[PDB]
Ligand binder design. Structure first.
Ligand SMILES: Nc1ncnc2c([C@@H]3O[C@H](COP(=O)(O)O)[C@@H](O)[C@H]3O)n[nH]c12
Ligand SMILES: *[C@@H]1O[C@H](CO)[C@@H](O)[C@H](O)[C@H]1NC(C)=O
Length: 261
């Protein structure tokens, strides 16, 4: 469908809230839903990818390409030297690789490869970025805008700022779309840089666990206790779908029927 665009250079809470709502309605399987939370399609949807264009205050752009089944950033393009430059992780290959290369930068127009010489897993990204953990990498709307400027159209940039930009972009686009809690952490701190708290990391880490739990619930009761973390890192025991439902924007795909509402 339509490329979804977010202008980070000229943002408001309301435009970012709109962007989330957009991304969530385009990503979701139109029919699937459990306890009223929309669920992503499986890997045989009629449309398998989503493109997301971001703009900085410099007016430079970066377009991310997400796999729609699990909202995974597979790679990105920028305008470079009158060419479309595509950057793809080193583990995307064959039919996926050439749907990504050709949808970010079509055949009929000039393009040039610039590999991401690592994979898109958080550990790998933390390592290139030089941090033990991603709570050391700050997030925010100015940071996202500044980061687009540091890479878009630049002949040379380090793998450290590229991995920092991808830690920020995966969390403010993909994690924020999966979790309404992370979207509300960006709006709360809209006008500042912030470090993700311990509930933000735990939710990221447990999205699959959470999706399967809700999908598998009977009359609103979770199959077993779910132990997550509060904003201060203390333990939180979830027993019922409506204790976690305020924080979840989308569900990972889980096979089978579930209570739809
Ligand atoms: N490049 C990327 N894009 C989106 N999500 C992720 C992730 C993490 O990816 C997981 C996605 O789930 P899968 O196990 O279905 O691949 C989420 O738990 C998310 O925290 N790592 N790298 C990612
Ligand atoms: C998916 O779920 C449907 C309905 O329960 C079932 O018939 C099918 O066997 C499942 N597929 C897989 C791979 O388990």
């Amino acid at each position: 469908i339509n490329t979804i665009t977010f202008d980070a250079g000229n943002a408001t809470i309301n435009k970012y809230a709109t962007f989330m709502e957009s991304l969530r309605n385009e990503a979701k399987d139109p029919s699937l839903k459990c306890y009223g939370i929309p669920m992503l399609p499986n890997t045989n949807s009629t449309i398998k990818y989503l493109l997301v264009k971001l703009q900085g205050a410099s007016l430079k752009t970066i377009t991310l390409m997400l796999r729609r089944n699990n909202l995974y950033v597979m790679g990105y393009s920028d305008p470079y030297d009158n060419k479309c430059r595509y950057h793809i992780f080193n583990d995307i290959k064959g039919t996926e690789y050439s749907d990504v290369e050709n949808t970010l930068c079509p055949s009929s127009n000039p393009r040039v490869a610039k590999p991401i010489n690592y994979n898109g897993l958080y550990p790998t990204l933390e390592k290139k970025a030089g941090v033990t953990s991603r709570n050391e990498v700050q997030l925010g709307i100015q940071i996202l805008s500044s980061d687009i400027g540091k890479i878009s159209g630049q002949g040379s940039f380090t793998e450290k700022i590229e991995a920092k930009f991808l830690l920020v972009a995966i969390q403010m686009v993909s994690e924020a779309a999966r979790f309404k809690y992370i979207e509300n952490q960006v709006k709360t701190n809209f006008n500042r840089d912030f470090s993700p708290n311990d509930k933000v990391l735990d939710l990221e880490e447990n999205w699959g666990k959470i999706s399967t739990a809700i999908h598998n619930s009977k009359n609103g009761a979770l199959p077993k206790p779910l132990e997550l973390k509060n904003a201060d890192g203390t333990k939180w025991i979830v027993l019922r779908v409506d204790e976690i439902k305020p924080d979840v924007g989308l569900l990972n795909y889980v096979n089978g029927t579930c209570q739809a509402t």
